[PDB]
Amino acid sequence: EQPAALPLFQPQLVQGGRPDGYWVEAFPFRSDSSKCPNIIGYGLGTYDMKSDIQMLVNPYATTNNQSSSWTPVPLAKLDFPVAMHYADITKNGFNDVIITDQYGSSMDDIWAYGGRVSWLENPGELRDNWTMRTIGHSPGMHRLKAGHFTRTDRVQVVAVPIVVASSDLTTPADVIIFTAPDDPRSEQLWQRDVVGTRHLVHEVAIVPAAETDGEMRFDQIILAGRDGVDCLWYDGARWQRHLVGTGLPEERGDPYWGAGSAAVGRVGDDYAGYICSAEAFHGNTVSVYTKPAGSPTGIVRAEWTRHVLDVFGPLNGKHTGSIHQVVCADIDGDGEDEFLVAMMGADPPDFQRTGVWCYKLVDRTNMKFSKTKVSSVSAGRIATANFHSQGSEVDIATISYSVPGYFESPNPSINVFLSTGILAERLDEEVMLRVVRAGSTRFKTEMEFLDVAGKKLTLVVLPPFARLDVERNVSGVKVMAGTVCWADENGKHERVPATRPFGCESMIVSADYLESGEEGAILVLYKPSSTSGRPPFRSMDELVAHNLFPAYVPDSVRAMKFPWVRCADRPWAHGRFKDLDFFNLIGFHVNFADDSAAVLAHVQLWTAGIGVSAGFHNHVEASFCEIHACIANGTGRGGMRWATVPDANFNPDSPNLEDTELIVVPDMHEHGPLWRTRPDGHPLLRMNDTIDYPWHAWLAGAGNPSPQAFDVWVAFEFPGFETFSTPPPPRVLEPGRYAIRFGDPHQTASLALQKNDATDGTPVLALLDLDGGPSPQAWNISHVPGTDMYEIAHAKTGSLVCARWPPVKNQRVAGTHSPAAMGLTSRWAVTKNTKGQITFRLPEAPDHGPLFLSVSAIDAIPVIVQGDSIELSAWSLVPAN
Amino acid sequence: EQPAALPLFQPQLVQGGRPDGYWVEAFPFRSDSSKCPNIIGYGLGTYDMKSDIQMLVNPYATTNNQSSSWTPVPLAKLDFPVAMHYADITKNGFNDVIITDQYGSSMDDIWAYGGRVSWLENPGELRDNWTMRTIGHSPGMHRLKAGHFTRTDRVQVVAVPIVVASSDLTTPADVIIFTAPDDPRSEQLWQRDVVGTRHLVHEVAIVPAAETDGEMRFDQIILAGRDGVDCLWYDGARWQRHLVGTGLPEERGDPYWGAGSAAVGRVGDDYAGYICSAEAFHGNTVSVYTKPAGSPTGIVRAEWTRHVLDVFGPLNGKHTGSIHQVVCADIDGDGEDEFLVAMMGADPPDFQRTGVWCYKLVDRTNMKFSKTKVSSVSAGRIATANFHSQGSEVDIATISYSVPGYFESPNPSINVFLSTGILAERLDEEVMLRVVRAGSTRFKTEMEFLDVAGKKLTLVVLPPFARLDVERNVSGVKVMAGTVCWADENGKHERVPATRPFGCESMIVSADYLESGEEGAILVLYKPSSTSGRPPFRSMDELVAHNLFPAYVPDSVRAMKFPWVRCADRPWAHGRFKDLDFFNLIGFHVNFADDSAAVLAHVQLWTAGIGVSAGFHNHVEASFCEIHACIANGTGRGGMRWATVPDANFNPDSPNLEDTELIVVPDMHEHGPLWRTRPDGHPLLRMNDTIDYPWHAWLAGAGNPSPQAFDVWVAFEFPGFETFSTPPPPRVLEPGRYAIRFGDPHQTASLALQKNDATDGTPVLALLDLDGGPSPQAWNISHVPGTDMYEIAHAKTGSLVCARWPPVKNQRVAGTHSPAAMGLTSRWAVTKNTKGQITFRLPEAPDHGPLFLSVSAIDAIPVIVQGDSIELSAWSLVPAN
Ligand SMILES: O=C1CO[C@H](CO)C=C1O
């Protein structure tokens, strides 16, 4: 339902210091699979250096991968290669390369016997130098694609020259269809028909038949050139043409007009929601062609109108600019394509024209797009695929544009940008993990990080309602943001950031899978390990932890060790904890990736051997709300104590254990909040802005340390938030859509947002349900995860019912998307009276009474908070829509 | 005084995808200057490819630099080059290259007519291919250095073969001194004397005469090889030898022992505080040689003892490992050298053996060292210099170790690591700036970031007591951490993070320079600009801001635009601020670089045209302590209002201006805190953990917006801290070293830390100043910047006098390096009685009385806090030492 945010990108330098650069392609070794494909990259070479067509091997294809290196394999070595594509010609499950070469060095140096089109035979294993067989020749051959254009039982290739001879920008060239013979393995010329003639075709794009949802039997050909952008397709019996548009208008003395490039973008069920374009040849102009809303799906049945989106600046003496290609891909996984624009770079340099721009369709109705910079290093061509994982995330690969006589990007290279919801950076001894918001990602991301105590601690982000397969009764989880859910014989089991104060949850997932809630989830997954020991842990050498980060995280992170250090030896000990078998392991900041850089939670680990107290403390030093999750309980008796006396009354240095209560925290459990809270759940704060705690500590089970057995536990340090209430109030309400009514079996009125106006600070009222009145306004009432409170949000606008500052007797009420922190004036405790009427109470402020949502009288009645009159605060809830 | 922390490093990839790799050198073009020198890098080549000796041009040499590219210049092209150095042979101010080539491909393939030693003549401008003249030949020539070894009036070169012929690891080779002739510009052989014979010399290091503080007239030669590490030097009349040590002991069947490498490390005034070493040839062993404390400075006068520091793992079938070089450099600028260890990499791969380890001398007395990973990409050789700035920061450059027949690091390259106290990362629309702690850096760092409103906003970190030259009466400053100071006709002027509540400081520096205090400083410097307009700013096009980040920050940051956006259009507007000339510019997180990743301050900007109110608000939404600094006041009347009535009494939507007070904030001023504070300065907190503010707003001066004039101001959002007191108490105390005494002209006792024990929680007492008693303990009393409070810290240990939790009547007192946040129980308000006796009062807690530092009676008297008896809380301060 909610707008999708962009993922994060982890850059990896695939191959650097290239001699030249021009083409890059996502190359699946097999035609059955599209997982972790390889990359093919090259440049045109020169008259001295034949160009190496390099098939760079994808590290993350080999399972349990350690390498970040892309092993280059020379597929072939060729005089001026230009364009390429692939398909399974031998029809054996292996992808063959099809490539144009013998082009020449420029549109001014065209080889008259050249423009060779050849295919390279995939031997089914990674050897170099593949067998080459010629398909055909046509001078100036400059782009091609494989597919099924007039038949399905055989590979066909469409191939087009940009010009027919040196310096000739006026003669149109032949749109050529080559057909595989029955035994392509005999050297012989491939059958050819010419299917049209065009001026300066600079790009060929294809729409596979399968994508058209039964509209076409064959692939459509989309040409961008001086004639503009058009669609060429075969119906079984004939070729036909449909003009999409004419592209840049000509200007005298400039031989370049029309289009340089074009792609077809999916929007929902329509494989062609729009067509984007770059203009003209190597131009600086981005435009999009649209079709009236309610148009038929596809290309040929709609008339298209051109809208210019940006001009990235003027052109030079050669009449060129900085745009070489556009492509479409679904970058944020919301089911509509974004488009990428390959910025070659400029002379003099200009970041605006270097790298990749990603344009998002923000408004499907008005066809408005907005742009974001994805990368700022030269992009001469762009390829998309998922280069690292099984899901439908989309990574971007690029190659610097460096071509003698056009533009030569300094330090030319191939890079890939790995889409991910988790990015890792070394700080010093601890790692910074930046995470996307779960609510707005459409992608699951897992990143393993530490192998310790029989477990692989894995950071996982889940999108709303996503599913996670686990190992029943073995896999453990700990929620840091959001909620996750599972079902067994007993019903639903939900995990939030913190369970009920002083409580104790099992982390073990007893089902075959879990699912995240409405807001998605961010959690630590405890995967069973065999590489980090088995309890009971009798010594600290047994608990040596191993770096788990995957090969695409940066090297300085992969190189990190996380040792256990005796607490006495940490720089914060100051002579404390001498002689204690008490150890610490740091550490991991999990923080939001967005512009807030807000903390999610800091995470670190501890151990204690038999009889060891971790020392009573109270967190006056630094502010946070801590939850612990024990991995191994040395004795089955270790756990948390807190003092039950006031603080003056307890001596942390010589503790009177009887003034404490113990909560055993068993293998793979987590405990509830121990800090002091106000009754609706807000945390008590000390005078120096720290969360207020009673004296507390982790104590290992007593006994003799022989044989030894270590407690091992993880610490989750959250910033302040509202938790559960004291006492826990009864459940008297279902989340749902409702009309909220006041009055009796005689004359009633309903809760309303004045004129349904979305503006922050719009008043909330009771509108008399009149004779021929408006119908009652719908409110979404919902439960606040990890609390006993509810929020009321306007069904149409989203606006939360909220008391104006400050919440006092007789205070007005309004709508807002700008709640106070911890929703102080926009959350509610519910009671149900014996009649069935609902009351909504504010968090009770320090020195004032309870304040309830209320009418002020008996043509709108205004809505205040007050607490003197029961009668004015009783509401009836009618399910609404 | 305080231990120096390491700086940060910004990596830059100097030259990637190299064919091979071996040597890197910091190469100053002129011998007069060492600023922003160039880099020389190469490998040995092969029998096919002569090796390019590349002089890579340093971008940051050209002033106001835009480029991050290192322009390669082929100096020469040579059969198997190995070692090199430089000096001014032509004696013209230009640095000439001296290089050994014609080596062969390996110790098994030594050219019998090779080992050529040649110099390359610096034409005084960056042309390629320099003139080459042969100095001499000796087969297997493998290392050399230039310097003055037997004379000063002429360049001399020491040159040494590692072996004399193919596969011969037993024949020792000649230590050769070459001397420049008087006219080196005539091709002729250079005069040679042999000065010794050694086995497997793998490194030559040099100590310039000038570094020895008059100990030597000539340079010392330090050789590492199978004979170990030794020193060879000339006294004017003879050569002499001093054995430092024998290095790795031989093990049978392994031809490698002794040392592979060695460097000489400064410690304070001693240019040779230690000698570090790597063992043996291409070995895996790091050791250090030490001299007894109280030894004479230098090398030849002390006996040296070897201590093995690490073994990084076993050796292979060739008997080699991963260490190629050690060097010394002063990395953290504290006046003692660290040493770097060049890790070649390993087969199979191992991060432990790849990159650079940096070892720090942590304990000068016991010669203990500890290590940190600085980089994890192959380092075959390491060069140090300051590649980017004028100060004495030290950058590290490296080249991958890739040599056919030894080890070939995949994807070989040259990288440099730029030392800096500020690192920049793009988040999304805002930049993350990570900063070092000022207290522990020895380096000034400036990084310009935004050119706006006639100013270049520059982030600056200053070490303690550092000096900053500025433009008198033009330069403006705003302190974010620490303090800075200046002097004019009126005395000292100090700037802290926030001035007195409701006050108004000028930011203009009226002196020629400022200085940071004891804790250093982190500040924004407002440099005058001509590239961002001139007030009055009549339209927002006038205030277009420009990205200022320097060329070594990453590209994705350099490519960022920071537009002004109308507040109505921001995603947090929710229909507010329609029709207001009210704009916003985001944005910059300044956060601590260390493992805490703690916030320093978030920074963003605003404008308002005539008559515009920025809207009354109270910060219930998000917690922070805000200070604003106006850059331009549209009218000279713009500024901050707050309400002076309680919050219930003020309507932010229809404000009654008379219930407010205004503080005009003139051009280049900043205002004091507007939030509510407890009387000793701790901030009032609301129930949802937000800093408590009265209704407040920025209002532009009234009038007609024609002609228009914009207020422009910057917002500093700090996390909570203690500010000044209400009312401001009188100054009755000087910071200083003191004995703290109780009693009368009859029998007295002084404040003491029990047994001067540094442990957290040691008791504080009053020890009767006895007959033959201990002397009175010294306390450092000091003023807490930005507050009216004092801290008492034990002069010997550092321990703060601090009341145990909770601060109540009769609470004990102790020492701690672990204060409560905002020093709640370890800071003090001072009063002076008419006698001259001092009282120390705690911050007054919500519901308890004042509590004073006190004795409990009239053989130690314990020290409590209490507040019933004046008499028990009066102290005498005697200046102590
Ligand atoms: O992008 C290129 C590269 O150069 C060739 C030569 O004309 C044509 C293009 O379109």
Ligand SMILES: O=C1CO[C@H](CO)C=C1O
């Ligand atoms: O969370 C904490 C806090 O620090 C103690 C050590 O005193 C132990 C923990 O588990």
Ligand SMILES: O=C1CO[C@H](CO)C=C1O
């Ligand atoms: O590091 C190297 C490289 O290889 C030569 C050839 O023996 C010698 C060394 O010391």
Ligand SMILES: O=C1CO[C@H](CO)C=C1O
């Ligand atoms: O600091 C603030 C807070 O936000 C307002 C806009 O209401 C303006 C500022 O300067």
Ligand SMILES: [Mg+2]
């Ligand atoms: Mg095939």
Ligand SMILES: [Mg+2]
């Ligand atoms: Mg010279």
Ligand SMILES: [Zn+2]
């Ligand atoms: Zn092109």
Ligand SMILES: [Zn+2]
């Ligand atoms: Zn999308």
Ligand SMILES: [Zn+2]
């Ligand atoms: Zn705790």
Ligand SMILES: [Zn+2]
């Ligand atoms: Zn070597």
Ligand SMILES: [Zn+2]
């Ligand atoms: Zn140092």
Ligand SMILES: [Zn+2]
């Ligand atoms: Zn404010």
